[PDB]
DNA sequence: GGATGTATATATCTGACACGTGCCTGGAGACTAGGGAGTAATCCCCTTGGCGGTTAAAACGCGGGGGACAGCGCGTACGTG
DNA sequence: CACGTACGCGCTGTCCCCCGCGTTTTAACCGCCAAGGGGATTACTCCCTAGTCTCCAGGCACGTGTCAGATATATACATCC
């Protein structure tokens, strides 16, 4: 449920989402 | 009056095995004498490093909508943290891939 | 095979009634029949004990009779001689021939490993002695199967001129099997017969194909590298009534049972298989229903080589199939003593276990 | 409808940096490993995990080499990598030194 | 003429052109010159022969003919290219 | 054959930091290799520290200096803290 | 009168958990020797703040010209289907 | 393998900034106190603690039975044409 262990290191929050979308690259694609 | 065989890891408040680290230090051909607090200290250090990487890998699995840590999550957790990146910069992780990074020269025009 | 993925693919199906169609229920060992009857009857049959030929025990014969009487209503077999009483007889002949000196020196170089002598004049020196039995079979078949082996024969005894005449002589005299094969080809050429030659390795098929190409004999070939369209072309060209083809080469384990060889008469097994059912379907390509000629099989065996225990295991499997399978259609101690013992106008095309 | 030259390469860059599969086929790599191994001695057997570990080592080494090569090509005011970029990277690393 | 050798020698060309292109796409390379592939094949051959020579030395210390994965791990470890996922 | 690994200890550490997150076998082998590699590095550095100071024993000071040398920056000082507190608890107890 | 969407009940997958068992490896207790802590002496090296004198290296200024960089053409080599 | 077009490369201008040289400063370097602490050895003493040994017991690994949540059907009520 709730984590019993945490990190005291003040490292920055990193977005780990490696999912990508090619919607911005549609200028040379079919759009 | 051998009271219930209290383990060293539970005495030290650790989860990593203190006595097994002591046995590996004694049989590892490092020195012919090993102090009492050295396996406690080393087990605590190994536990802390394992906990830090496992926490970042769990965060990386959470951001990828996964409930099971794969080597890709470990690679992302190691490479996105700069202190772990210069701890394991000479280390290959199998089935880990690379960080998604594109140089800004190669980006198109707008 | 019980551990093959098709077994778990088919055994998990929700099926009330199953049925298996085959021609060879026993191929190598009783575990194949055990897997088949476990696919048929799950848990009812409990065949676990193997058959030891070098035991001669009465309880083993009782086990054999129990395996007979247990599967009497579950197995239906009809032989090709019990029905359609017009089939010509099929005779097989085992020919054992002396090795050449090149074959003997390659055999003693492989068996008593001689890497310095095995490389010798080879520039690369990449001789692999993994799978010792496979290298012994290659040495028993032909010395030219090995790399950098033809030029040592050509430069030292054939004088190395390579002027279209000494190469055929080198292929004839390099192996001890191709002198008898050449005599058989000349005898079947001067008579009215067509011959198929079955081989286990397609490199030996290449050797025979190059030999027949430089001989001047219209030959055809079929192996796994040939696609199905060219296989159909080769079969329709060989089975044509106006065919100029004389000899047809086969890889043994290719094409299944759907290959048509009505025009063939003689079958030459160059390489014996570990599974005798593969050889049975090999000379059964010409010995089907409707053959107009007496089918004759010549088996080419190297003397005092690795192929003798290959024939020993093949005859042990044939004795096993004649014991369990052939006696349970629709003297056991005698056939057990026959299977327990070791075995070890000559090319005439004319003529219980 | 034809595409501009470069957006397909960017799509493959964004695609292959996400997935972690091996980009070299198994059988040519096994044949290459056996050919390279057989000159040191003959008759070498190979575990499957050994060839797999060699494969991921080659993957990581060559991907890191192409990152250094791309940085050399960008530093030379180019977007096309050349063998001079490869030999420049290996030297600064010390492989050609 | 059906004559050919059993041992194949062009397996360095078995690392094909689209495989090297996929490797450079993972490396973030947009454009590839035509002379890249032979240099990449030579570099791969040099790296592979270094690692395989060390692994064969590790194997024949153990008096074995089979190259295990742990020998490859040790051979990569000695050169400073340590690999995870096979040590245990 | 009882094959030694660090499986259950890394698993309980994972359940401490993430109680609802699982792990795969390849990731577990990677974590085991990481723990073995870090243990080997710290033990070798501590053995060298004992050898340079003409000391035949390895105590908590050698492991502490090995952590301060090998682990870079702030990761060292928190790891040094975490170990140092544990030795204090174990002394209170044994 | 036939055909279609939603709602509760039962069989099956699936990872996790309770129990069993071996066994072997870690822990408890006792003993001992030696490694390391502590002390004293001796002597050489380092620290911080000064001085004097030499002198070669560092700093500064200025002309100029060689090289970095931007722009343009082109043709070919690489991307794309 | 065919097409097509983008980019690597060659050429030219231009301006700017680095290099060469002369002159002036300045601090590095070498040689000096002035005392005092740090540290490397040599020798000695003492005592705590880790190795060693014996014995035992529970933690870990394996195997297996079950169990609660997730998934897939079985049948009944409401509803469109």
Automatic annotation (TrEMBL), chain B:
The keyword Coiled coil does not apply. GO terms for molecular function: DNA binding; protein heterodimerization activity; structural constituent of chromatin. Residues 82-110 form the Histone H2A C-terminal domain. It is found in: Chromosome; Nucleus. The keyword Phosphoprotein applies. One of its GO terms (cellular component) is nucleosome. One of its GO terms (biological process) is heterochromatin formation. Its main location: nucleus. Keywords: Acetylation, Chromosome, DNA-binding, Isopeptide bond, Nucleosome core, Nucleus, Phosphoprotein, Ubl conjugation. Residues 1-79 form the Core Histone H2A/H2B/H3 domain. Residues 1-9 have a biased composition (Basic residues). It comes from the Eukaryota. Core component of nucleosome. Nucleosomes wrap and compact DNA into chromatin, limiting DNA accessibility to the cellular machineries which require DNA as a template. Histones thereby play a central role in transcription regulation, DNA repair, DNA replication and chromosomal stability. DNA accessibility is regulated via a complex set of post-translational modifications of histones, also called histone code, and nucleosome remodeling. Belongs to the histone H2A family. The nucleosome is a histone octamer containing two molecules each of H2A, H2B, H3 and H4 assembled in one H3-H4 heterotetramer and two H2A-H2B heterodimers. The octamer wraps approximately 147 bp of DNA. This is Histone H2A. The lineage of its organism: Eukaryota, Metazoa, Chordata, Craniata, Vertebrata.
UniProtKB/TrEMBL annotation, chain F:
One of its GO terms (molecular function) is DNA binding. GO terms for cellular component: nucleosome; nucleus. Residues 1-69 form the Core Histone H2A/H2B/H3 domain. It is found in: Chromosome; Nucleus. The keyword Cell membrane does not apply. It comes from the Eukaryota. Keywords: Acetylation, Chromosome, DNA-binding, Isopeptide bond, Nucleosome core, Nucleus, Phosphoprotein, Ubl conjugation. The keyword Membrane does not apply. Belongs to the histone H2B family. The nucleosome is a histone octamer containing two molecules each of H2A, H2B, H3 and H4 assembled in one H3-H4 heterotetramer and two H2A-H2B heterodimers. The octamer wraps approximately 147 bp of DNA. This is Histone H2B. The chain holds residues 33 to 126 of 126 of the full protein.
